[PDB]
Amino acid sequence: LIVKRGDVYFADLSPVVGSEQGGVRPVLVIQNDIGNRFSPTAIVAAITAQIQKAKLPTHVEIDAKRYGFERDSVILLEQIRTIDKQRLTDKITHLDDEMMDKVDEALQISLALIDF
Amino acid sequence: LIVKRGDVYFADLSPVVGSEQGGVRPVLVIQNDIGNRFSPTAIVAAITAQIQKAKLPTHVEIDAKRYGFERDSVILLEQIRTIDKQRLTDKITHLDDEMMDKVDEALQISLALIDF
């Protein structure tokens, strides 16, 4: 399955332990597009509808109406993982470059790669 | 449990699906140190001894003798994840800044954040 960075998919993240975000949920593809094209795995960030506002500097708000979600959500760039593509089902949307610039910043904060 | 970016720990990554790296194994802490201090989760990259040389630009070689491993290994910056700290057991070592600069580069390649 070929996916693209910026794509939002449903993925089954279960099973999990403790404070890991689990379940079948929207996730954001954050791996590079070479990996996304040739690798059997993708790297994704969990998205939650449990909150609507950022609590951490690794959170990016998704306005539901603007971005094609049912409900205002938050991308958790502190909740990331590499998944086999067989966990993926439906493509939900693709976030634009302005939104991805924010995700990039949050990802840098989450992994201590701040260059700005 | 307080961990530090650059620390190498054993973590139980199981269960997994498909091409996800699983088992109890050495992993590298790549999350920022605020998260590492106050969060119940850490973000880590899987390390493998199955290979000794980089096959991808997301791979970083660990010379066993230089860095305190039993065997020449490879850090897989394409195999990353957020884990509850309860998966962690033994601290193996702490990689120096010169090595972490290479890991940072590989992580940027893996997540399309190249700024160099």
The reply to whether residue B87 touches residue A30, judged by beta carbons under 8 angstroms, is no
Which positions ≥6 away from B114 have C-beta within 8 Å?
A: B108
Token pair, residue A51, equals 């909150």
The reply to whether residue A79 touches residue B41, judged by beta carbons under 8 angstroms, is yes
Which positions ≥6 away from A79 have C-beta within 8 Å?
A: A20, A21, A45, A46, B41, B82
Q: How far apart are CA B18 and CA B63, in angstroms?
A: 28
Experiment used for this model: X-ray
The class (CATH top level) of A1-116 is mainly beta
Which positions ≥6 away from B80 have C-beta within 8 Å?
A: A43, A80, A81, A82, B30, B43, B44, B45, B46, B107, B110
CA triple A103-B106-B85, angle to 5 deg: 70
The reply to whether residue B31 touches residue A82, judged by beta carbons under 8 angstroms, is no
Give all strands (DSSP E) within B1-116, no chain letters: 7-12, 24-29, 41-48, 59-62, 73-84, 88-94
Q: Which residues of A touch B109 (CB under 8 A)?
A: 32
C-alpha count within 13 angstroms, C-beta hemisphere, residue A56: 18
